[PDB]
């Protein structure tokens, strides 16, 4: 019942937009990417925050999409953006914590939208599950260095 | 003119909500307070995000509202929900001071925006957004990366 909850269709949305965000980003003025980032990730943060409790049931495992490669590929594509402006000491880089968030929210994404209601619940519980930690800390501050790249 | 922008109009309603939630803060348990705060703030930095250009008018000074005893007053209540989860290093700092920093820029814009007076309405929305930028921003995503450690990071820490 839950994956049928209106705060989790908001977030898949969001998620998406996000991951299509991320995935296009080539070449894209680092301005532009950085203003656009700062809007992307506190809604995203938000919408995971609304999220419902989910209970993982653990019994057939949810497809992984992310690999080395996709992964490897984003985070030099999104270092190029930010430049000279990706590093910051905490030394930390704002490529490899979106690449890192990219990662739960894509690998959850993929899965809710292949159809079988089981993993589409595990996914979600898996992604809920990494949010306090994980992508959910990388999230928070990540958007302390890019708040810097801009107004800093 | 931008006083009336969809977007103002948003910002305005999630500001009033933060204050309304910071000024109310006696009424509730620690865990209330950062569940929820963790759901305001992020709403509060996209919607800032999201204002239109304004350029000061001058003229005429907006009325302030938050006076040395209201800071004070307010931060020592947030102190003492929070209590020893106040304090994160990331050089100290204090939640508390934090969200009372933010509070006066946010509460001295919704207390003029509402006297109705065109002139004043858009200055003093200049001056958050301005602001925004120069220093309550940072505070707003450095507080959030700690309440999100109060919540959610392993206890039982040395």
């Known amino acids: 019942q839950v994956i ?14 996000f991951c299509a965000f991320l995935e296009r980003a080539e070449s894209m003025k680092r301005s532009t990417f950085v203003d656009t980032t700062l809007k992307i990730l506190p809604l995203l943060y ?9 209970e993982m049931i653990g019994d057939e495992s949810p497809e992984t999409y992310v690999t080395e490669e996709i992964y490897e590929v984003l985070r ?5 953006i930010l430049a000279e402006k990706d590093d910051y000491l905490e030394k930390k880089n704002i490529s490899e914590d979106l690449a ?21 619940n595990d996914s979600l519980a898996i992604c809920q599950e990494n949010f306090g930690l994980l992508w959910g800390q990388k999230l928070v501050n990540t958007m302390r260095a890019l708040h810097d790249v801009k107004y800093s």
């Open 4 to 17: 049928f909850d209106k705060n989790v269709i908001e977030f898949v949305t969001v998620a998406a937009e």
């Open 46 to 54: 938000l919408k995971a925050s609304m999220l419902p409790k989910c």
């Open 76 to 80: 030099i594509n999104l270092a190029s």
């Open 100 to 120: 890192d968030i990219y990662q739960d929210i894509k690998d959850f994404i993929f899965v809710f939208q292949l159809g079988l209601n089981e993993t589409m």
